[PDB]
Amino acid sequence: DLPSQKQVIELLDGEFARAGYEIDDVVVNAATRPARITIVADGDKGLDLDAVAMLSRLASGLLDTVDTGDTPYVLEVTSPGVDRPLTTEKHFRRARGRKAELSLADGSSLTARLGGTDGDQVNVVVAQGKDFAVRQIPLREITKAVVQVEFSPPNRRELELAEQTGKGA
């Protein structure tokens, strides 16, 4: 059949990196006519149309080296999307379960999946080895919070924790 997400990534990651680009995610969708393989990539300087086309050429060339069989697919290389910034406690509540990039007041940053709010805290869920940590961060320590677009579905255990912690609308 079609290669797994992991197969596409092992196939492309090195070449993409060698071209100066990072692979953020890969989606092999076999539920459309025809199937779509989506590569989500980025560089320090985003993806302009030149880069999108170059990486599409790269990726398609590399994927032709693979036995797809009689199964027909379409390839797309895209930038990671943009999603809402969050300002109020209500916003955080509504964004429970979403992945977020948080800038902290001490200058550090953190990518984590948002849990519920709890008093003046927000719960966050972070991967830690094969397991997870649930941390509370005070709203007054978050100076920027941006929800990320997700292409592959969230890790099931991670989403379970993020969605059954604290309050969220």
Tab-separated table of C-alpha atoms in Angstrom:
chain	number	residue	atom	x	y	z
A	1	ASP	CA	0.000	0.000	0.000
A	2	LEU	CA	1.162	3.531	0.885
A	3	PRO	CA	4.188	4.225	3.085
A	4	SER	CA	3.543	4.998	6.732
A	5	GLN	CA	3.998	8.511	8.063
A	6	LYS	CA	7.193	7.206	9.666
A	7	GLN	CA	8.361	5.826	6.287
A	8	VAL	CA	7.827	9.183	4.551
A	9	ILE	CA	9.672	10.978	7.356
A	10	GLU	CA	12.668	8.589	7.354
A	11	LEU	CA	12.763	8.962	3.578
A	12	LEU	CA	12.628	12.774	3.452
A	13	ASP	CA	14.018	14.196	6.688
A	14	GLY	CA	17.695	14.048	5.729
A	15	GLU	CA	17.262	15.489	2.265
A	16	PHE	CA	14.960	18.246	3.546
A	17	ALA	CA	17.519	19.093	6.243
A	18	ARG	CA	20.295	19.026	3.652
A	19	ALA	CA	18.283	21.554	1.671
A	20	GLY	CA	18.075	23.736	4.793
A	21	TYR	CA	14.499	22.795	5.707
A	22	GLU	CA	12.843	21.023	8.628
A	23	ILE	CA	9.952	18.577	8.418
A	24	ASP	CA	7.306	19.449	10.979
A	25	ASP	CA	4.741	16.783	10.177
A	26	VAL	CA	3.549	14.314	7.572
A	27	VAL	CA	0.024	13.114	6.836
A	28	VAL	CA	-0.651	10.074	4.629
A	29	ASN	CA	-4.394	10.333	3.919
A	30	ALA	CA	-5.785	7.230	2.182
A	31	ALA	CA	-9.447	8.267	2.507
A	32	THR	CA	-9.618	10.557	-0.542
A	33	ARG	CA	-9.774	9.980	-4.295
A	34	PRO	CA	-6.977	10.120	-4.846
A	35	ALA	CA	-4.967	9.779	-1.626
A	36	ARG	CA	-2.997	12.798	-0.425
A	37	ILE	CA	0.431	12.772	1.154
A	38	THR	CA	1.004	16.086	2.926
A	39	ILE	CA	4.418	17.267	4.048
A	40	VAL	CA	4.419	20.140	6.534
A	41	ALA	CA	7.814	21.854	6.398
A	42	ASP	CA	9.517	25.030	7.598
A	43	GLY	CA	12.829	26.892	7.501
A	44	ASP	CA	14.250	29.645	9.698
A	45	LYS	CA	12.717	31.969	7.126
A	46	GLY	CA	9.371	30.287	6.434
A	47	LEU	CA	8.465	28.658	3.097
A	48	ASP	CA	8.127	30.954	0.073
A	49	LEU	CA	6.750	29.672	-3.253
A	50	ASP	CA	10.266	28.917	-4.535
A	51	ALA	CA	10.885	26.740	-1.494
A	52	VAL	CA	7.506	25.028	-1.711
A	53	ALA	CA	8.144	24.109	-5.323
A	54	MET	CA	11.755	23.011	-4.702
A	55	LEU	CA	10.710	20.765	-1.812
A	56	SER	CA	7.812	19.378	-3.823
A	57	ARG	CA	10.249	18.413	-6.553
A	58	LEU	CA	12.592	16.891	-3.969
A	59	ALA	CA	9.854	15.011	-2.165
A	60	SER	CA	8.104	13.715	-5.273
A	61	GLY	CA	11.424	12.564	-6.702
A	62	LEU	CA	12.226	10.685	-3.498
A	63	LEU	CA	8.730	9.192	-3.217
A	64	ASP	CA	8.964	7.784	-6.733
A	65	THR	CA	11.837	5.635	-5.449
A	66	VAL	CA	9.205	3.909	-3.296
A	67	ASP	CA	6.823	1.113	-4.304
A	68	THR	CA	3.372	2.683	-4.112
A	69	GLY	CA	1.856	-0.156	-6.138
A	70	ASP	CA	-1.344	0.591	-8.044
A	71	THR	CA	-2.412	3.104	-5.382
A	72	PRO	CA	-2.513	6.683	-6.815
A	73	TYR	CA	-1.511	9.618	-4.588
A	74	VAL	CA	-1.119	13.391	-4.746
A	75	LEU	CA	1.705	15.231	-2.993
A	76	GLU	CA	1.514	18.615	-1.268
A	77	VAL	CA	4.230	20.529	0.614
A	78	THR	CA	2.913	23.320	2.827
A	79	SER	CA	3.939	25.615	5.664
A	80	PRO	CA	2.545	25.023	9.148
A	81	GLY	CA	-0.609	27.108	9.456
A	82	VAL	CA	-1.268	29.977	11.866
A	83	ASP	CA	-3.956	29.897	14.578
A	84	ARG	CA	-5.311	32.397	17.184
A	85	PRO	CA	-3.259	34.232	19.832
A	86	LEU	CA	-4.819	33.984	23.296
A	87	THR	CA	-5.401	36.961	25.602
A	88	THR	CA	-8.011	36.301	28.271
A	89	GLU	CA	-8.764	33.527	30.762
A	90	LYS	CA	-11.811	32.805	28.621
A	91	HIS	CA	-9.544	32.323	25.613
A	92	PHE	CA	-7.368	29.815	27.446
A	93	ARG	CA	-10.480	27.975	28.680
A	94	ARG	CA	-11.748	27.724	25.107
A	95	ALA	CA	-8.328	26.522	23.898
A	96	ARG	CA	-8.132	23.576	26.286
A	97	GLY	CA	-6.673	20.567	24.442
A	98	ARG	CA	-4.983	22.729	21.822
A	99	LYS	CA	-1.230	22.724	21.343
A	100	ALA	CA	0.300	26.104	22.158
A	101	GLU	CA	3.527	28.002	22.012
A	102	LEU	CA	3.876	29.991	25.249
A	103	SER	CA	6.336	32.801	25.870
A	104	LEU	CA	7.128	33.177	29.558
A	105	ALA	CA	7.871	36.354	31.495
A	106	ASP	CA	11.412	35.196	32.318
A	107	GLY	CA	12.191	35.016	28.598
A	108	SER	CA	12.010	31.240	28.301
A	109	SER	CA	9.399	29.587	26.067
A	110	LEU	CA	7.476	26.324	26.065
A	111	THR	CA	5.474	24.193	23.652
A	112	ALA	CA	2.879	22.195	25.539
A	113	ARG	CA	-0.771	21.135	25.123
A	114	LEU	CA	-3.145	23.367	27.065
A	115	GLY	CA	-5.154	21.944	29.930
A	116	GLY	CA	-7.913	23.777	31.748
A	117	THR	CA	-7.535	26.885	33.839
A	118	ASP	CA	-7.369	26.529	37.633
A	119	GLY	CA	-7.772	29.732	39.607
A	120	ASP	CA	-5.145	32.048	38.129
A	121	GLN	CA	-3.202	29.120	36.693
A	122	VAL	CA	-3.275	27.313	33.402
A	123	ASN	CA	-2.600	23.583	33.266
A	124	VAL	CA	-0.175	22.479	30.583
A	125	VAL	CA	0.682	18.982	29.426
A	126	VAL	CA	4.219	18.242	28.285
A	127	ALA	CA	5.801	15.084	26.917
A	128	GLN	CA	8.534	13.718	29.139
A	129	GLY	CA	10.136	10.551	27.845
A	130	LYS	CA	7.413	7.992	27.166
A	131	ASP	CA	5.318	9.710	29.863
A	132	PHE	CA	3.865	13.173	30.609
A	133	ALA	CA	4.117	16.017	33.059
A	134	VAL	CA	1.153	18.187	34.008
A	135	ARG	CA	2.304	21.611	35.097
A	136	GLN	CA	0.532	24.716	36.322
A	137	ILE	CA	1.740	28.041	34.962
A	138	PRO	CA	0.308	31.284	36.381
A	139	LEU	CA	-1.408	33.430	33.712
A	140	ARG	CA	0.680	36.381	34.919
A	141	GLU	CA	3.832	34.511	33.732
A	142	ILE	CA	2.631	34.029	30.138
A	143	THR	CA	3.392	37.054	27.940
A	144	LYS	CA	2.445	35.357	24.685
A	145	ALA	CA	0.333	32.320	23.831
A	146	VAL	CA	-0.245	31.109	20.310
A	147	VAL	CA	-2.356	28.087	19.408
A	148	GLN	CA	-0.692	25.850	16.781
A	149	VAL	CA	-2.438	24.239	13.807
A	150	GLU	CA	-2.186	20.432	14.027
A	151	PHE	CA	-2.189	18.121	11.016
A	152	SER	CA	-1.637	14.714	12.576
A	153	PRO	CA	-4.077	13.990	15.405
A	154	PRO	CA	-2.892	14.676	18.981
A	155	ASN	CA	-1.205	11.958	20.994
A	156	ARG	CA	-4.099	10.161	22.714
A	157	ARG	CA	-2.698	10.058	26.248
A	158	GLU	CA	-1.616	13.716	26.007
A	159	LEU	CA	-5.044	14.841	24.825
A	160	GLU	CA	-6.719	12.777	27.563
A	161	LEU	CA	-4.766	14.663	30.245
A	162	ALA	CA	-5.142	18.065	28.667
A	163	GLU	CA	-8.932	17.660	28.273
A	164	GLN	CA	-9.758	16.358	31.771
A	165	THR	CA	-7.742	18.834	33.738
A	166	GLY	CA	-9.005	22.150	35.178
A	167	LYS	CA	-11.836	24.119	33.549
A	168	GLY	CA	-12.457	24.993	29.887
A	169	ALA	CA	-15.802	26.570	28.867
